[PDB]
Amino acid sequence: EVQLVESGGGLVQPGGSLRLSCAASGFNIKDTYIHWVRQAPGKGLEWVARIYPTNGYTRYADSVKGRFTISADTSKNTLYLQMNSLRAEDTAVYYCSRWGGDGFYAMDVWGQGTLVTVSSASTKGPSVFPLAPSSKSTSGGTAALGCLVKDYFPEPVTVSWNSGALTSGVHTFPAVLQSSGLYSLSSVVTVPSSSLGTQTYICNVNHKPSNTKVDKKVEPKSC
Amino acid sequence: DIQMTQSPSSLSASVGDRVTITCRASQDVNTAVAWYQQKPGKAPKLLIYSASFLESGVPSRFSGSRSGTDFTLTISSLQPEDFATYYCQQHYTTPPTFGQGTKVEIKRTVAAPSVFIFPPSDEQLKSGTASVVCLLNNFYPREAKVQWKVDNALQSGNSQESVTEQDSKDSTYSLSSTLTLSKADYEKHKVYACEVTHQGLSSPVTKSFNRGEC
After folding, report:
1. From the candidates A99, A104, A127, A128, which should be mutated to test the interface with B, based on the most B CB atoms within 10 A?
2. B103 and B114 part of one domain
3. For position A35, which CATH number holds?
4. Three-state SS string across A100-128, please?
5. Domain endpoint, select from B91, B108, B125
6. Domain enclosing residue B141, as ranges
7. Domain stop point among B45, B75, B108
8. Residue A5 lies in domain
9. Residues A69, A130 within the same domain
10. Is cis: bond before B59, omega within 30 of 0?
11. Which of A43, B139, B152, B207 has the most CB atoms within 10 Å of its CB?
12. Domain ends where: A80, A101, A120?
């Protein structure tokens, strides 16, 4: 199988430089045109640059020429995007893709992407808080519980429940940027009220950016 | 550049329905249009290249077409796993440009939200903040109205909502409103209520509690 992998993204200060990389397997990059396409969070797909590795010709989008450079090393079968003068508008997920060539001049192989977030703000790991049941009145039918994963930078965080065993009616919401520039999310789960207290509920929050890995056991209260 | 304009911007369609998404190029782009599918937190994938040819391994139910400068993707029988954002693209000129996307969601029967309200945790409260949270679980349609009332006084802009993508098991959505205040304001009021109003909700449900580590 034909794949494409990119790497090198991360939190970068405005005005810095970054080199993202894209490695092709299963095909020689020589034969093709390789593209770098980004997608800002929530927005559309935007094209950034093309290179033809053989004669080495390149083409840039206007928002990016000058400051970015796409290059390729055909012996290392890898390709690179040197990004300079980075702006907060360069926060996006970057994918490289192959234009087909042989019958299909559309982009058939796409990488998984790598997130570049351009900010002055510091990595901060989450405060994990419980969202306990029994808020005033205890027990009934289905009861919900969860974890509020507060104030962290950048993204992502991952939330698992009982170290990947409770997967059922588990709702990990979207992160919201707070007024502060810090994210927050909640992971909630619905369980029997019979199980509340026969069973423990822990949520496993991991923030790979700040090397935080929290476990917080959610158990019931009364008011 | 060449502007690709796509309509609709989003659509609900039930399973079994014929769906039709259109992109209209800004100029004759001839037949240099490819259509992409993008499943949440996943890369694009080619469905159709040069207006109308299917990519190898894509189900017979997708098809594309050209009429002048209008290009159409049609899914004859929408399956529940075609939940996605479809994008068109012209590759006729540099730059390649993309339509702004069409989010296809699955229509299903109106379910009411179950409503859970959750007071703030004591550890949070030490840090001098109280985040009251209101959960509306497994409902449809997506629209719902969550109003916060603190001692009957209905709150403005201290609330932020977040919604799950559509579930794929049962096509429902979930939603959390988070009221965040200072523990100094949290502690001068008593009843914190979350009034929910939904379509499958006969009458506005109210989930509430009385303040404190009581």
Report:
1. A104
2. no
3. 2.60.40.10
4. CCCCCCCEEEECCCEEEEECCCCCECCEE
5. B108
6. 109-211
7. B108
8. 1-120
9. no
10. no
11. B139
12. A120
Count of structural domains, chain A: 2
* Sheet with strand A68-73: strands edge to edge: A3-7, A18-25, A78-83, A68-73
Side-by-side strand order, sheet with B62-67: B4-7, B19-25, B70-75, B62-67
- Say whether the peptide bond before residue B44 is cis (omega within 30 degrees of 0): no
From the list A100, A108, A142, the residue facing B114 with the nearest CB is A142
Q: How far is A192 from chain B, CA to nearest CA, in Å? A: 14
- Is residue A161 located within the same domain as residue A180? yes
Tokens representing A39? 């997608």
CA distances from B126 to A137, A166, B13, B122 (A): 24, 30, 48, 6
Mark A177-210 as b/e (b = at least 16 C-beta within 10 Å).
eeeeebbbbbbbbbbeeeebeeeebbbbbbbebe
Cα–Cα distance for residue pair B106/B126, rounded to 1 Å: 44
d(CA A181, CA A38): 22
DSSP labels, B64-115:
EEEETTEEEEEESS--TT--EEEEEEE-SSSSPEE---EEEEE----BPPEE
Last residue of one domain, picked from the residues A86, A101, A120: A120
Cα–Cα distance for residue pair B52/B32, rounded to 1 Å = 10
* CA atoms within 13 A of residue B133's CA, in its CB half-sphere: 30
Judgement on whether residues B100 and B2 belong to the same structural domain of the protein: yes
Method: X-ray
Q: Do residue B210 and residue A59 have CB atoms under 8 angstroms apart?
A: no
| Residues in B 137-176 with any Cβ partner in A closer than 8 A | 137-138, 160, 162-164, 174, 176
Measured distance CA(A54)–CA(A29) in Å, rounded: 8
Residues B121 and B66 reside in one and the same domain: no
Distance from the Cα of B194 to chain A's closest Cα (Å) equals 13
A115 & A135 share domain: no
Regarding whether A102 and A21 lie in a shared domain, the answer is yes
Residues 6+ apart with CB under 8 A from B82: B19, B37, B75, B104
Phi, psi (rounded to 5 degrees) for B175: -160, 135
Cβ of B164 and A171 within 8 Å?
yes
Considering only CB atoms, which chain B residues are within 8 Å of A171?
137, 164, 174
Which CATH number covers residue B81? 2.60.40.10
Number of residues written out for chain A: 223
Number of domains forming the structure of chain B: 2
Contact A175, A203 (CB under 8 A): no
